[PDB]
Design a protein around this nucleic acid. Structure first.
Ligand code: ZN
Lengths: 1110, 147, 48, 49, 147, 49
DNA sequence: AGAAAACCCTTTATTTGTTATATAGTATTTTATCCTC
DNA sequence: GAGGATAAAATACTATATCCTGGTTAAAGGGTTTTCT
RNA sequence: CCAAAAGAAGUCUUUCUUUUGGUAACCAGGAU
């Protein structure tokens, strides 16, 4: 549509969108360039927040500096963070297992406050991992994604909880800071206002107020409008400020002698000295907004103040009093109401920059601790800024973050859509967020403030449902971490084109209409009554004069993955959730095909994911090949694009890239120049178009099972390539000298045929489980001084030749060609982990066809494993001899409420055959509002039905009534959309017509070949002698507690006794039963399991005298 | 009753163990914080893996190598002291550590309700003072010599 | 095919909520990698 | 849990609008979370019984 | 008195004495139940009980050496307190105070941890086991089969 | 004490069983499953065994 | 005989101190206050 | 006014279905030892 | 229970004898 070479996909959309879809990877990239402080972010903030532009690093270095000693006779300060160029390109870093990072330098200045001798230096602060142009990090070769975290913003939260004993309303307030100490004010069943500083027992608020320097006269002067505060003051029992300080000291400081100076200083230290208490800028902003204190002054300062505390107490007591609004002296009035903590005005987003800033902050705190401890144990005038700084904790924090965290994860690379979905994810679980096992049902709900900001459909189906969400298409995150959505403001009933981004609170104040409303070509609603959203998400019918805003489009409340489901509004939310979640499990196929009926989101999602090659500058193609494309730019310069051929992804799939241009074509900037894994000419192509029938067939498509044609196996329609990675390295060791070689002890030559002259197998050789990939031997150890042997070694010269082959064998259940071998070595001064001499990596590839038990799926949540694969002759075939490819059961459709698949089938038939609306005498009425150049289409036409503005039922019916014949003038599918099929197995025609069409089905990464496993006997564990677990070792299936209850219920005592003794851990029973079976004898009697004896020994180790009596 | 168990069980009895039972189960005393010699890869002596205490690491092979044959059985080498037998015995033989001071068991001190504080009638708060060297306790007094 | 004749095999689906989550069948060889289950035992196993 | 008094007025054959779809998701997700969280309580109860 | 009498009657009825609450020797579990195995490259994988036993042995040896050498009462009591804390960590790590942490600031697995929870000996290994002669796969529909 | 220790609160059951010096007669299904003996139900009782 | 680069041991210390997303259930110690003598 | 007995609150411990696979496994500092010049 | 080497017999490739060699916990992600 707005891409220079996109395919012509004609849309059914009736509406027009004013706003283009933003960059879909803007969250990550605009959050990181704020952290490092790029000029791009500087300009972006200038045209917005020019009042105070500062990056994350500069903020950390400003809050840290200066670092002073108690005497104040010397200080250390930091400034001007600076980055060098990256150490190596992205491709080299990924190939050689190097972290993609850049050096960081700061200017530390040391001042002696009694000699004025200033000493500045440039201090190296470590290597800082840098984000690539696709929103990912490259840590130790692998590609990672940092996920954005949904947390609760810091501020003041008022809530009311009923009381069981008295049936009274009990209000409360919590002042949650960033990295500080809490303090709650509450009204208990008795009419008194308490306080819980830090986390202690309730104390009257009067104690705190007096400790802050308030006389009993001032309190009753300002807080004289409530009976509760007077009641609390009267029964205070505390007179004098010092007494209040002492009481607070008693409560807070356990078992210490109270005094005046310590109590005076500790209270101000806890909440007012900003080294132990911070609110951030978001917290200060939220407190000022809730209480309305400083509307004008800019936010500089992050500590509490007496004004804030007194205002909070007054707000709480007036809320309990039942007031409506409150004005604070020196500040505008505000409404008095309780808070909802699940409101997207109270939940903010910690993006990829905020998290790294927090980690740098703790690292710098540790470093400054070391610095100020080291400033007192070194003699002055020998100190230089380089001898105080210890950079190791800082670099340690970064490593800990990027290696160990629940937000730093391996990038999801099942297919291109998976990674884009991974980068736009908002997870509520992490360090500092709630927990999967401790999350209720009120936080998993879809609050009405999510509209336009978090997609209500796309979320995990398991125990993570509701705790992980995804960002909508048009949403952006503002400077404080709050999500915004564009709205089209309507002035005096005229729908303008001024787009304004509103966060959930502003959207709360106003009244918002709907996108699919009847605009009359002049920005005027046809009727006065339109559905709107009122304050608490209420939906009503307001006359079209109060409306303030309208949505920029439908498809504003959905995310990227959910915007690719055609006919989404005909499917219930339960099945649409599955349809969106199963699109990121599809596996790339050997050849890709774009859907006949899409939604128009595929091109944008494909170009923004980044798996395609896009012309950086316009020019003319000079050379094309399977390996590269050379573009000749309009001005002299040339550029060569290299391709990724058969490269493994994080999940073991193929990552091909092939060109889609010829040697003479001219390309334009931003034009797709080479396809990717799951792209067909620049558009996402996750599956294939299959001819489908919707009948029950002989019980093989029974209960969600599926029937496939054998053509899909012969013609490699659903074939995929899977690649495996195997690693081994040679390490020094204390004994020394690990070696990769062909000379392996106790190995014959027949099992050393595929290996090349120096170990590793040859490229192209097919392997089976157990074959050796890299030959390797290590010292046998047991360095022993046996007289004759040792005296022969020492002077006579007998060699050690102690070897123990730790070779690399291909594990159980694996095979395929050897496509690549990557060998590192210390001889070539390659950067390897310390103590490693050599490192070799072998890639093994398989090509898998579709087979029974493999999982398939559509875009509407119609999953199911393949039940049978019929020969092409015994399948229902059309009157012209065309067999169907897939057969789906009827009983699954009407009960699940996903009728969108039937409409997709009808429109797919119409698109495949091509149509022509006969406007011989006037266009038909059903085709009146149908866009032009949709009145006719050629066979195999690609169309698009946007998610909430697509093809109506009347238009589908009309298109079905007029559809082109195939070769002879025969129309196979009638106006109802059904065809007369023949039974290819018996020969007779089926008595009634059946629904046929084209559906777009996907192959999911749940194949049987990874799921099948069996075991007679094999490896056993060590501590307990039970069999191992897992397919790669061998392992047995687990016979758990529930399966034991089932067998006890049946009454089968002998089966249960043998299963637990002579099949698991009866060490002599195992061998005896094997011998009895092979020799044809009777199975012997079981003994005692070994785990019971292990249990007895552990109990005895706990100093318990366990003994078995007779 | 049974010792190595032949499944003639009639009962399973649990109870507190005294020091005399602990040093009766034992086959030796561990008195060095060593596990294994990294170079020869053989267990050290008087360590956590000593072959004299816990038994041979290899079937019918002593530590010093004087005995290596099955014919030798049930005899303790006079040099290394390792008893020549099957290596499976390392799953069965226990040692013990002879503490230089008495130490309480945390199961009968901490677990709520405190069972030492019920046996002796002491609140847990001040029992923790006694057993962690944070206060003295009067264990005995003469009440007539006093008078 | 001679060995497996009239030798029962126990099939089990997790979670085994009740007794009929384990039942014994008579195996027969099939082409493929998937276990074929009778349609009239899915209510007992609760197996779609 | 209280009824929205609007109500949704379209069938899934006609296709719901954006607001109707939103207010329907409100209860759809509640239903899904209910199952997700009862699957474990059933097993704990059976284990105790 | 009703609560107290439970334990007092328990210690009264039986011939067992209450002195088993205070320990003078500690048993050591057989090596095969706390194994260290050779990972390729001269790297070993300890069982995480060896660290806890080593701490006990080190503290006991230091206290034993500080008594014969002669020292004030302050230092000897400090060593005894630390020895007391080591055995507590060996038997139940983290029930009193800060858990003893190994590499990566992860608490060690004490003896009590081998018995508790879904991953304890009982539920994990005694009541449910992995077995031989087993297999698994994906089920499909068998409309041609008999019942 | 074996069945109760394997059910819940292993540490508390074990400590109070040790203090009471309890003896287990091994008469239940779970206790016979743990030690590897034929359960006293169905086909494992003396009438049929 | 002295200097530099690689081993062996320890320990995550625990202050008159660097740590705030669960609820639901029961059980046991404080403790605070009220009632009585 | 003092002591005891009963509500209250405050901490302490315990539990939350089954199955599968994939990536990592210590750092940092002090004292010492050995080899090289 | 397997691999390698040597000796003997026959078959043209099996048997007999001797020697050597022979795992877990965390965190994370999915499925029903
Ligand atoms: Zn010997």
């Amino acid at each position: 549509n707005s891409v220079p070479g996109a395919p012509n996909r004609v849309s059914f959309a009736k509406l027009r969108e004013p706003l283009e879809v933003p960059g879909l990877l803007d969250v990550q990239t605009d959050s990181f360039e704020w952290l490092i402080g790029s000029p791009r972010w500087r300009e972006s903030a200038a045209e917005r927040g020019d009042v105070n532009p500062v990056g994350g690093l500069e903020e950390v270095l400003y809050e840290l500096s200066p670092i002073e000693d108690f005497s104040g006779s010397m200080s250390l300060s930091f400034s001007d963070p600076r980055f060098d160029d990256v150490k190596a390109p992205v491709d080299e870093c990924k190939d050689k297992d190097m972290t993609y990072a850049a050096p960081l330098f700061v200017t530390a200045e040391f001042i002696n406050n009694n000699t004025g001798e200033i000493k500045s230096q440039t201090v190296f602060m470590g290597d800082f991992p840098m984000m690539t142009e696709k929103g990912t990090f490259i840590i130790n070769g692998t590609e990672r994604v940092v996920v954005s975290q949904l947390v609760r913003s810091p501020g003041v939260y008022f809530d009311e909880t009923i009381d069981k004993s008295t049936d009274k309303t009990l209000h409360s307030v919590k002042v949650i800071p960033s990295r500080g100490a809490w303090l709650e004010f509450d009204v208990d069943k008795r009419d008194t206002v308490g306080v819980r500083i830090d986390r202690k027992r309730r104390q009257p608020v009067t104690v705190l107020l007096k400790a802050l320097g308030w006389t009993s006269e001032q309190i009753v002067e300002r807080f004289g409008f409530s009976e509760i505060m007077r009641s609390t003051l009267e029964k205070d029992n505390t007179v004098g400020t010092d007494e209040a300080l002492l009481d607070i000291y008693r409560k807070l400081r356990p078992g210490e002698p109270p005094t005046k100076e310590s109590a005076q200083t500790l209270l101000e230290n806890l909440f007012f000295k900003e080294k132990r208490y911070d609110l951030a800028r978001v917290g200060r902003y939220k407190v000022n907004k809730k209480l309305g204190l400083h509307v004008g002054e800019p936010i500089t300062s992050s500590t509490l103040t007496e004004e804030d505390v007194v205002a909070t107490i007054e707000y709480l007591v007036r809320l309990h009093e039942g007031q409506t609004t409150m004005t604070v002296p020196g500040g505008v009035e505000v409404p008095v109401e309780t808070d909802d903590i699940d409101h997207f005005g109270n939940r903010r987003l910690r993006t990829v920059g905020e998290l790294i800033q927090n980690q740098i902050r703790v690292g710098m705190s540790r470093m400054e601790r070391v610095v100020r401890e080291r400033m007192t144990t070194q003699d002055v005038e020998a100190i230089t800024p380089q001898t105080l700084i210890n950079i190791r904790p800082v670099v340690a924090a970064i490593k800990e973050f990027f290696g160990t965290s629940q937000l730093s994860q391996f990038m999801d690379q099942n297919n291109p859509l998976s990674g884009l979905t991974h980068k736009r994810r908002l997870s509520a679980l992490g360090p500092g967020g709630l927990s999967r096992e401790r999350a209720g049902l009120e936080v998993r709900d879809v609050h009405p403030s999510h509209y336009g900001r978090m997609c209500p459909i796309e979320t995990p189906e398991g125990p993570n449902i509701g705790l992980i969400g995804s960002l909508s298409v048009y949403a952006r995150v503002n400077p404080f971490g709050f999500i915004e959505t564009p709205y089209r403001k309507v002035v005096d009933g005229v729908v303008s084109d001024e787009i304004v981004y509103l966060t959930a609170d502003e959207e709360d104040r106003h009244v918002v209409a709907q996108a699919n409303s009847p605009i009359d070509a002049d920005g005027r609603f046809v009727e006065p009554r339109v559905l709107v959203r009122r304050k608490a998400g209420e939906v009503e019918y307001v006359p079209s004069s109060e409306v303030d805003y309208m949505d920029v489009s439908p498809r504003q409340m959905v995310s990227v993955a959910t915007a690719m489901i055609p006919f989404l509004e005909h499917d219930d939310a339960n099945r649409a959730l599955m349809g969106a979640n199963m699109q990121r499990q599809a596996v790339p196929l050997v050849r890709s095909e774009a859907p006949l009926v899409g939604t128009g989101m595929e091109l944008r999602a494909a170009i923004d994911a980044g798996d395609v090659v896009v012309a950086e500058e316009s020019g003319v193609i000079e050379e094309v090949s399977a390996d590269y494309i050379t573009v000749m730019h309009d001005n002299g310069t040339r550029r060569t694009y290299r391709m990724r051929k058969f490269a493994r992804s994080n999940h073991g799939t193929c990552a091909n890239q092939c060109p889609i241009v010829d040697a003479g074509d001219r390309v334009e900037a931003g034009q797709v120049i080479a396809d990717g894994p799951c792209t067909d000419d620049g558009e996402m192509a996750l599956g294939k178009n299959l001819l489908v029938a919707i009948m029950p067939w002989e019980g093989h498509n029974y209960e969600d099972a599926i029937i496939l044609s054998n053509r899909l196996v012969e013609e490699d329609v659903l074939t995929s390539i899977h690649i495996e990675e195997h690693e081994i390295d040679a390490r020094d060791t204390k004994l020394g000298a690990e070696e990769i070689t062909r000379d392996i002890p106790n190995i014959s030559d027949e099992v050393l045929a595929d290996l090349d002259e120096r170990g590793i197998v040859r490229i192209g050789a097919e392997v089976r489980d157990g074959d050796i990939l890299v030959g390797k031997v290590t010292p046998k150890g047991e360095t022993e001084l046996t007289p004759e042997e040792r005296l022969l070694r020492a002077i006579f010269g007998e060699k050690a030749r102690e070897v123990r082959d730790t070779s690399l064998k291909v594990p159980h259940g694996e095979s395929g060609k050897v496509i690549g071998i990557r060998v590192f070595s210390r001889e070539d001064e390659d950067e390897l982990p310390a103590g490693v001499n050599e490192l070799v990596r072998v890639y093994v590839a398989q090509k898998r066809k579709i087979s029974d038990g493999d999982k398939l799926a559509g875009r509407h949540g119609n999953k199911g494993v393949i039940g049978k694969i019929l020969p092409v002759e015994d399948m229902p075939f059309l009157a012209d001899g065309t067999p169907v490819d897939i057969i789906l059961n009827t009983h699954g459709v009407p009960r699940r409420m996903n009728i969108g698949q039937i409409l997709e089938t009808h429109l797919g038939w119409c698109a495949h055959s091509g149509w022509k609306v006969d406007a011989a005498k006037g266009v038909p009425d059903w085709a009146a509002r149908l866009p032009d150049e949709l009145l006719e289409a050629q066979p195999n036409a690609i169309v698009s039905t946007p998610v909430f503005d697509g093809a109506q039922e009347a238009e589908l019916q009309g298109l079905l009534s007029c559809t082109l014949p195939n070769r002879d003038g025969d129309v196979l599918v009638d106006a109802d959309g059904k065809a007369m099929l023949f039974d290819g197995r018996s020969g007779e025609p089926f008595p009634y017509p059946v629904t046929v069409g084209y559906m777009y089905i996907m192959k999911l990464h749940h194949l049987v070949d990874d799921k099948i496993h069996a075991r007679s006997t094999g490896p056993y564990s060590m501590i307990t002698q039970q069999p191992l677990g897992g397919k790669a070792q061998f392992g047995g299936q687990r016979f758990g507690e529930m399966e034991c209850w089932a067998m006890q219920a049946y009454g089968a005592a002998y089966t249960l006794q043998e299963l637990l003794t002579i099949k698991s851990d009866d060490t002599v029973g195992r061998v005896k039963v094997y011998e009895a079976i092979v020799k044809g004898e009777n199975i012997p009697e079981p003994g005692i399991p070994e785990s019971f004896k292990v249990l007895l020994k552990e109990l005895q180790s706990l100093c318990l005298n366990v003994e078995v009596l007779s | 009753g049974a010792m190595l168990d032949v499944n003639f069980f009639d009962e399973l009895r649990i109870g507190l163990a005294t020091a005399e039972d602990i040093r009766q189960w034992s086959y030796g005393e561990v008195k060095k914080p060593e596990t294994i010699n990294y170079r020869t890869l053989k267990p050290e002596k008087d360590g956590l893996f000593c072959e004299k205490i816990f038994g041979p690491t290899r079937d019918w092979e002593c530590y010093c190598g004087k005995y290596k044959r099955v014919r030798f059985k049930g005899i303790i080498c006079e040099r290394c002291g390792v008893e020549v037998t099957r290596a499976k015995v390392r799953r069965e033989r226990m040692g013990h550590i002879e503490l230089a001071a008495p130490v309480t068991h945390i199961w009968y001190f901490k677990g709520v309700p405190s069972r030492l504080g019920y046996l002796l009638d002491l609140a847990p708060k001040d029992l923790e003072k006694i057993i962690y060297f944070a206060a003295y306790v009067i264990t005995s007094v003469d009440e007539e010599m006093r008078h | 095919e001679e060995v497996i004749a009239e030798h029962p095999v126990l099939l089990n689906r997790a979670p085994t909520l009740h007794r009929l989550g384990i039942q014994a069948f008579e195996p027969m060889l099939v082409e493929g990698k998937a276990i074929q289950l009778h349609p009239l035992v899915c209510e007992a196993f609760n197996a779609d | 849990g209280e009824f929205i008094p609007r109500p949704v007025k379209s069938s899934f054959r006609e296709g719901l609008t954006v607001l109707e779809y939103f207010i329907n998701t409100h209860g759809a997700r509640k239903g899904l979370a209910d199952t997700a969280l009862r699957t474990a309580d059933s097993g704990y109860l059976t284990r105790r019984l | 008195a009703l609560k107290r009498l439970k334990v007092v009657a328990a210690f009264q009825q039986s011939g067992n004495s209450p002195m088993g609450m205070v320990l003078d020797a500690v048993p050591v579990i057989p090596p095969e139940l706390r194994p260290m195995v050779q990972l390729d490259g001269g790297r070993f994988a300890t069982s995480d009980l060896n660290d806890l036993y080593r701490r006990v042995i080190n503290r006991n040896n230091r206290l034993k050496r500080l008594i014969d050498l002669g020292a004030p009462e302050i230092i000897v009591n400090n060593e005894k307190r630390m020895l007391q804390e080591s055995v507590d960590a060996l038997f139940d790590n983290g029930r009193r105070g800060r858990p003893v942490t190994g590499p990566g600031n992860r608490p060690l697995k004490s003896l009590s941890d081998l018995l508790k929870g879904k991953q304890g000996r009982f539920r994990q290994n005694l009541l449910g086991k992995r077995v031989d002669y087993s297999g698994r796969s994906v089920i499909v529909v068998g409309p041609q089969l008999k019942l | 004490w074996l069945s109760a220790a394997s059910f819940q609160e292993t540490t508390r059951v074990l400590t109070d069983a040790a203090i009471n010096c309890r003896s287990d007669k091994l008469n239940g299904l779970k206790e016979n499953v743990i030690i590897g003996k034929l359960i006293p139900a169905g086909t494992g009782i003396n009438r049929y065994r």
